[model samples]
Target: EPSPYVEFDRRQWRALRMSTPLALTEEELVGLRGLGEQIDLLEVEEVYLPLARLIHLQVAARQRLFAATAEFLGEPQQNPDRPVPFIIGVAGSVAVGKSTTARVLQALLARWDHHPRVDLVTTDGFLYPNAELQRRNLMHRKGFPESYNRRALMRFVTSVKSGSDYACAPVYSHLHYDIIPGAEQVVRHPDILILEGLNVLQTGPTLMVSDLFDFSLYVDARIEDIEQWYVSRFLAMRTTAFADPESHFHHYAAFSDSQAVVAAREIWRTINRPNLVENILPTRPRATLVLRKDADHSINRLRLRKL
Candidate 1:
């Protein structure tokens, strides 16, 4: 049987770059750095430029459809004061650079003259607080699906997509490894919203978090490379954020390089690997598009589900 997806290599995808300007500077990309690597301008121009263009067209088409449907139903046209945001979901395993992808897309999508207001909300905030995780004895399985407040996340997405004037998400702190009480990220109705996280594509028998997305993406790489990146990121943090006095992993700062490597590998083996194999990897087929990365962390190809 023929496949339901169209695949494109880096060259073919780059050729689709539709005269869009690279409005982002290298310094800006540096600030959007992922765990262990920095994506250069060339990568952005080659890979993400076309993607931003595609998303722009898709959002425009959706808006047009909405207007037409409203008119067909004898309903009033959308109020300019109540802008409904088109939501994009980005999903991948730990250390696969989905966060960076979301950030770059947000930046590029916003630069489009029409979609000037873009917001990004990571699902980390929807994870239960550390104390709640501890109470449930899920501290070691923090990134697993059960650790999240799925109901709250679903409601948040529903509210945003309903064209509410504004929506607020709780703030999560990596330094503290917990949700900060009383801290929130308010999203005024944006032209686009990128909802990114590890399990954004996860599904069940009922309504899914991704059901609220206008488009969804999955970042994929070889399991070995992802494990390598995870370990490398953990080691890099030992000398960086891990050394901070208030860091959740501050105790890891004193570990020797070899010890850190061992610890990181063990964590990956026990936690991340299982989660990826058992939970995350299975959700890949559900994404609207899948970005496959090469060993050096550059996406060499992409597969878009056929329309």
Candidate 2:
């Protein structure tokens, strides 16, 4: 069988930047870095600048195709020439830095004058409320596919794809460890929308979340590397967010360093690890591109699917 991807090493991938000037400042890069990520300006220029360019080119091509199709169908004047938002899906393991990737792309892509408005929404908000999860006995499977309100998630993506004037996604509170009622993130006519989540690339025998993406990325890393990152992030959170009185993990704040590591490992062993293996990892092939990370959390390689 023929391989469907064109793989690239670090040097080869970085060369694809094609002299694109760095649009991100060190301060902004710092702000976009996730808890355990060590991404720097060079990494951004080398890894993501090329990626942003690639996505921009795809957006342009899609725009032309849309107009051509409209004209072919004899409805050219019925629809205006307004640009539709290009939707990107970023998927990866819980601690593999998908959020950081999404945030970095959002900032960088927005710098492009053609598409200055970039919006990011995480699938975490599609999770069922804590009460609902508890009542349904899905608390242990919180990050699993079944824990999410799939229908609502599909509707949100479909509405955005339909180019609605505005689309609202429910807000999720990581501090509260649950969905925030009556809170929504409103996106209005964005030029690009990035959807990041653990299972955003999920697909089945029928339509799925990724089916709505104009492009998608999967942040890939070895299981051991991601496990270590998960534990490290948990340790960092214990001293920070977990210490807040209103935090859902506030009780973990009292745990000693060793105890925190042990608890985090236990959760990863039972929950996160299984989800990565069973759900997230399997969807990797469905991504348009895969950013493979080294143990140090820098993307060292990439695999782009053949057209």
Candidate 3:
């Protein structure tokens, strides 16, 4: 099998451990899970433990490269003392567990002593407002690349990569399902910025978001399994998150389980599935690592590019 990736099952990947051991406990892993996610100590030990080590490996290598460049440039006044942020991009389909993956990584990576300062930003903030989407007649393509304010997103990533002292990204509310006007998230020179999104790896006119990432990951699974997970999450949310009277999906709270499942499938068919097939899935191979999952939604294989 000729491929850029060196693929391995969970056990195989678990055999490859970092010099540093797993720092997080079972309790912390569960709290980091997304709404329907179940992240355990085993999953974290087998997957994220070694993966965090790999990220640190890359970050360390990048620092060495920066040091070499500094020496060549006669030690320019630019923070030779301080290295800029190491960006990590996470991308996957609607319910492929990427959100949980991002949160887990954020929690684990922050445990590292080399760089305890970690910042996480989701590209959801860069998505145009529902008003703008409806006005532009792109309400149906919310997660699609075109629905994003490309220039703003590019500038945000660029500023972070440019080693700015402080940079702000727009704030998004999942409850409202909209970008909050005049709200922003400030990153104060983080050691690493985890940028997670449905299409974070998608390229653009100027500096691509993926291009700025020192490391990138794609949470992957079979399309059928992803659809099932999406439907399940929607049903769960109907009784919980969406049940809030003020929620954007408040109407869905009225749906029975079966009705919610059918509506979820319809949503997957009409909106999310198309976006996944067309935009998201294609960028999987471009990631430094791809975490493929089993039917139970636990990561089972690690696909890492040889470089």
Candidate 4:
């Protein structure tokens, strides 16, 4: 049975979301992961688990509603031709932990018996290649709305929703900090697809990305706190992934902690902060739900648009 309550304290939230009764253990959760972001089990219970359950019920309801629509049209109600993958857009600022939210939701939602096949794709892969950005002198605006291949992204989702056999999305390489040439990810008949990125909520004159989303989620936090976390994560990577010889940011790996923080802060101020102010924050109200976080990356509250 699904939870009747949406509003809950951190303690009660666990009961509401986790009550659906999967035989999940710590091992199950260990695989779900902490992706360069903080997530205590309590936070996951309070925040993501309920959200995941919400998505599950929404998907279930859509199935029921569309089954009727199929019956009206005199088609085999379960026809693959009529299938549409439920699309979830997870959007937020660079260090606000949206990716963690998306990944957690993907894992939890997949655990449901009704829809066990879940796929995750980051919109980073939809970002324009570095050479293209440089050619257009837009390198500094990398995470801004225009830095992405909007039409390509829309077409990918459009194909998925239209029940296409497969849709290919160009793969973006963080190690190289660019799109891999001729490299693509083929999405094939997923029950649910999670699209994660900073600009997944953006609304443009040509195509509003959020319009294609069945349910959209936004992770939000204070600018000052996010700036600190950005620097913290950057420093963490400096000692880890960025330290790899093949990494695009390998040069920063040698920086002292102080140097790394300075550089990270500079990048945040010049790049991420501007984009968040000009583009991301404005779209907060556009989300179906907003998960507001504290400085520690713990979700403090949940905000959902009223029925």
Candidate 5:
């Protein structure tokens, strides 16, 4: 009998066929420090690589089906065929380390023999410019779905899915905390595309944007832990990155350590917390898989749908 729970035990999960074995050198393992000690190549090699390989196989199968459908419809498919873009969405709360996961997976997936041209794109680029957000009185709600240019995002995904040779997404600078004019990241026919953002899994009957996801992942952790992590990261940035004259947050660097801590907490309470609860967390169940993190930020369990 099938288990009532949607998630399988680890052994049962491993028993399922995996397309490729994960192998990473010690050097590659060291590079995973970008995610901090909370995650590492062990998790990548044992967990995420297998999942990404599965997604690659799924993409191939879907492309075959699409070809057959085109033939059945009496439509001629293009010669010198371009591979379908496998779209993966990485969704999680602020400070949950989804960005790190996305970067790591992109690197790992590219190492696979099947997917050499892997790309990672964060939805931060789709966010409305700071001036526009401030004009709309939405500066405090910057991470919310409403803060993104949904129509533009949808169009970019649509073009990529349709096998367009080139598509460009606007560029955003974290140092300035704003969209930079006349700067865009060009995408040119990648085998796999990883989309990462806080609320990337959000969907509604009326929202077609979410329909573009070929696979999705959600990084999960306790709310209290996430809040603490956010605060700590903010403090670290204030003393280091924020002190740089080029940083838009340089103004905060002048604050005393205690004052900076208080300001960070206030920002979290006013902005990030509500965005997480109302927009990000609500989309968790929509993900194809969930990486559940412990208080220490290490992935303790993986919950994958039995597709």
Candidate 6:
């Protein structure tokens, strides 16, 4: 089958050369470093700032074109009414560092002069709570497409796109591994919104998530590299977050090193790996941009779809 988009190998893709030095606020720098070995602010300043600036410009140009089209069609001009929030989707396999990528982008974009009020939302919140998934017999398929509340997610995106003054998204707690009742992230007409998840790109003919995205990014790496990253992250979590009494995974902290390794492999094989193959990876070509990762978990190359 013919490829839907152009694919550029690492050596051929010229790295973006920025004229001005990228800057990061102290707070954002601290946050980026907090992710531990996952990522750092230097990567954000060097790799992400330029990309965020490009996206900011693209969104502005799109809005201008939309306004012109509306005027030509004799429709009511709404360009001056409210600023359209640029919605960016980030997707990748488990432990490929997409979450860190999303967070870094969010912080970087917010610092950009073009977009001051940036918000980041993860699709994990849209997943049905643990009890609900268990009741529906979808516990084993936790990260699968069927596990999410698709309708609600769509509605939330629609509301944001409509320029609603106030929008609320349900909050999911990683420690509890469930949707927090009455907890929400209130978004108020931000200049940008970053949506991230393991399966953010999963879509269908009737109600495609990609249809709502203004720009989308897919983080990718070799399957073997991803498997290793997953095991490493799992081991790290066991020592750190998983050991906390308040953590939902605290019980796993007691597992011996060998047992933990076995458990990590099993979870990856049964859940994350299958989800990546059957759902996430299939949507790679649909992305507006792709960030291919190297074994070191750094972006080795970036591919932008031809407009």
On lDDT, the leading prediction is 2
Native-to-model Cα distance after best TM-score fit, residue 208 in candidate 1, in Å: 2.0
TM-score of each: 0.96, 0.96, 0.95, 0.90, 0.90, 0.91
The stretch of ten residues in a row with the least summed lDDT in candidate 2 is 76-85
Q: For candidate 1, write residues 1-307 as lDDT tens digits.
A: 6888999999899999979889999999988877687578999999999888888788778888778878899987687756568989999998999999889888888778754788899999999998999999999998899999988899888888888778889989999999999999998877778999988889898797788788999999999999889988998898889989999889999999899999999999999999999999999997888999987998899998886
Put the candidates in TM-score order, highest first: 1, 2, 3, 6, 5, 4
**lDDT agreement with native, every candidate:** 0.88, 0.89, 0.87, 0.81, 0.80, 0.79
lDDT for each residue of candidate 6 in 184-277, tens digit (9 for 90 to 100): 8888877778888877787776675668888999988999999988887787788888989999899999888888899999999999999999
Per-model clash counts, in order, read 0, 0, 0, 0, 0, 0
Candidate 3 structure quality by residue, lDDT tens digits, 151-171:
888788888777888888898
Q: What is the lDDT of residue 231 in candidate 5?
A: 76
Instruction: List the pairs of residues colliding in candidate 4.
Output: none
The candidate with the higher lDDT, 1 or 4, is 1
Which residues of candidate 5, in runs, are more than 4 Å off? 1-5, 8-23, 26-37, 78-81, 205-207
Error of 2 at 135 (Å): 2.4
* Tens digit per residue, CA lDDT, model 4, 42-121: 66666676777788779878777767887899876586534568888999999887877787787778777765678899
Error of 6 at 237 (Å): 1.4
lDDT for 275 (candidate 1): 90
Over 4 Å off, model 3: 75-81
TM-score of 5: 0.90
- In candidate 3, what residue range of length 10 has the lowest lDDT sum? 75-84
Q: On a 0 to 100 scale, what is the lDDT of residue 8 in model 6?
A: 59
Please state every model's RMSD to the true fold in angstroms. 1.3, 1.5, 1.6, 3.7, 2.5, 2.5
Give the Cα error of residue 126 in candidate 1, in Å.
Answer: 0.5
